[PDB]
Every structure is written in C-alpha cells, then in structure tokens.
Design a binder for this molecule. Structure first.
Ligand SMILES: O=C(O)CNC(=O)C(=O)O
Ligand code: NI
Ligand SMILES: [Zn+2]
Lengths: 349, 8
C-alpha cells in the first residue's frame, strides 16, 4: 500500500546506500517511488562526477535544434529544426544573451506562467542528443556510461548499440527549451543528471493514469492519432498543467537543480522545460519489472528506424515459464503499475 | 536506431 497518493518522492541516500545503483532503484521502488512516474535522488555531498567543467567550451554540439512551437490554450505542437554545428562556447553566448536569457522572476509559479505564456515566441535552441559523457573514467557510482543494469543484455547478446538508450547523451539547454509529453523508448526507465546550470522543471503523470493521458491526447489531436497509434512518441506534443487539471489527469511537478538526479519509471509520462543555460546527461536503463512493459510497449510505426528492442532475450532468461505462450502470442499478462520490481524483495522482508 | 529529443 506504498505511496498511495502517487506523489513525486525525493531521496537522500548516504554514500553507502548510493554505491550500488540497481539496488538503490529497487529500494526506492520498495518505498512506492515508481507510482509517481518520476523520482528525485539527491546524491551525497562528498560525491562529484567531474572535478571541473572549465574545459568543455570546445565540445561540439553537432546538430542543435531550434524549437518552433505552434498552438494555443494549453495545447501545442513543437517542430524541432536542426541547425548547423556549434560549440558549447557558441551556445552559451546565445543562451545568456539579452535575446534568449531567462526572464526576471520571483516565485517559480511566476517563471512557469511566463513559460506557458511565451513558449510560442522567440524560438530557442536546444543543444540536445549530443553523444558523450561528462563523468570522469574512474567514477564508479551512478555512472550514466555504465549503470550495470539488465538493459546491458541488448549489447551483450546481439552487439546492438542504440545511441541515447544504451549509451549516454548530453543536453545543453537554454531558457524555454522544452521536452514534450512522452514515455521512454520501449517504455524503459531513464536517469537524468543535471551537471550544472539553471534548473530543469518536470511534469509527470503516474503510470497508472497513463492511458487516461493518451485518451485525452488522442481527442485533442485526432488527426495525429488517426495516422499513428503512438504519436506521443514523436515527442512533438505539449500540454499545459492547467489543461491536465481541466480534464482530471493526475500529475505532479518537480524542479531538478544542478547536482540532482531524476529517475523516470516505465510508462511514466513526463514533460518539462529548462530555466536557462544548463547541461544534463541522460540514458535509459531496465529492471526485471521493465520486461513486461517492454513486451507490451505500443510503438511508433510511421517513422523509419524508430527504437525497437528484441524482447526475446529477456523473456527467455527471466520468464522461461511464459516464453512458449508469449511466442504463440497468448501471453495475456496484465500489468499492475503499483507493484515494485522483484529485486525490491530484499527491502520488504 | 537512436534516441531523439523530438521530430518535426
Ligand atoms: O532533459 C530533457 O530534455 C528531457 N529528459 C528526459 O526526458 C529524461 O531524462 O527522460
Ligand atoms: Ni524522458
Ligand atoms: Zn508514429
């Protein structure tokens, strides 16, 4: 009966708790964290992934995107236009310039209103999807380059690399840069570490009301829905929290600060924006709980070469009793979004 | 074959 409100939880592990990543994810799930779709973990003070960020101004952002937003009344579509390569130095100059910098504000609620008031104006540049990592090679705790989860079975058995999914991405943000409503590819988990800069704000719908958000999205954008079941996977759809309130979709809000991790959980819809110049690192990962989510993930079919993982390896290894049934197409398992991952048993005994 | 922030 854990986290019955399904609110976003924040955790403050000691360095001892922190060390084993998979095991801490099982712990937070034993506390009900997954029910929110999104959780915050504040790493211990003594922890640091990089001694300094003084040297990265020469790093290349090979395909920055200008974010053109169209819409009104809490409903928008974002078009992401690939601009020419620029350096982090070139990006920071634009980010902090009078034209693109963060407006003056008092309370977060004020910055949030300005975001929803102004997101269709003066399209910003998001330095998104940059292959690479800012962790130093020796960093053994919560290293996004090597978290050591069962997602590693993809590369271990097939040799398949999916950039961003089983490798890390860097994201350089400026004010009013946005991520649209979405779950992860194959409904995996994600991890996001805010290396530096101004905050990133998040909205999250609980996985248990996820279908409700899809039904509503389908109604607001019926053309997009009629031509692709999984159109939210296109990552173009922005919906304000006032609209979510108006139609009864439970959601939570959270602001991530420099030095904080966010975890997103399978089928946890999330969206948000950056406050100003910052840098985040992200990848996906898995637990045993994810396997059923992966078997049932509704995928985008209308775009070529979208992210699709063979589940075969995972069903054979962790669900050998159900493999023949699954392969016949007769595995009718119903997901219970409240249940924690099997690995949490250690913490519930 | 790769993760993307979003399309057009
Ligand atoms: O930071 C962004 O642009 C959005 N991040 C995520 O969606 C994530 O980490 O799952
Ligand atoms: Ni995400
Ligand atoms: Zn599609």
């Amino acid at each position: 009966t854990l986290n019955p409100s399904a609110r976003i939880m924040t955790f403050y592990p000691t360095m001892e708790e922190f060390r084993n990543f998979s095991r801490y994810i099982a712990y937070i799930e034993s506390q009900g964290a997954h029910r929110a779709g999104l959780a915050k973990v504040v790493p211990p003070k003594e922890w640091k992934p990089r001694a300094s960020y003084d040297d990265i101004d020469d790093l290349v952002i090979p395909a920055p995107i200008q974010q053109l937003v169209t819409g009104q009344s809490g409903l928008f579509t974002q078009y992401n236009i690939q601009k020419k390569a620029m350096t982090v130095r070139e990006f920071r100059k634009i980010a902090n310039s009078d034209k693109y910098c963060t407006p003056r504000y008092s309370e977060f609620e004020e910055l949030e209103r300005k975001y929803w008031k102004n997101l269709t104006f003066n399209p910003p540049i998001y330095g998104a999807d940059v292959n690479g990592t800012l962790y130093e090679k020796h960093v053994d705790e919560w290293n996004i380059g090597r978290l050591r989860t069962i997602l590693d079975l993809v590369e271990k058995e097939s040799g398949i690399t999916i950039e961003g999914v089983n490798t890390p991405y860097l994201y350089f943000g400026m004010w009013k840069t946005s991520f649209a409503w979405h779950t992860e590819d194959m409904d995996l988990y994600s991890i996001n570490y805010l290396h530096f800069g101004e905050p990133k704000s998040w909205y999250s719908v609980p996985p248990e009301h996820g279908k409700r958000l899809e039904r509503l999205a389908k109604g607001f954008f019926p053309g997009s829905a009629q031509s692709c079941e999984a159109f939210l996977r296109h990552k173009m759809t922005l919906i304000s929290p006032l609209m979510l309130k108006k139609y009864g979709i439970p959601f939570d809000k959270v602001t991530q600060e420099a030095g904080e991790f966010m975890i997103t959980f399978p089928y946890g819809y999330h969206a948000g924006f950056n406050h100003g110049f910052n840098c985040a690192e992200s990848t996906n990962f898995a637990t045993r709980r994810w396997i059923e989510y992966g078997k049932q993930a509704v995928l985008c079919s209308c775009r070529k070469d979208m992210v699709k993982i063979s589940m075969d390896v995972f069903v054979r290894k962790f669900q050998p009793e159900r493999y023949k049934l699954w392969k016949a197409g007769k595995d009718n398992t119903v997901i219970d979004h409240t249940l924690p991952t099997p690995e949490a048993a250690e913490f519930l005994k | 074959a790769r993760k993307s922030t979003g399309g057009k």
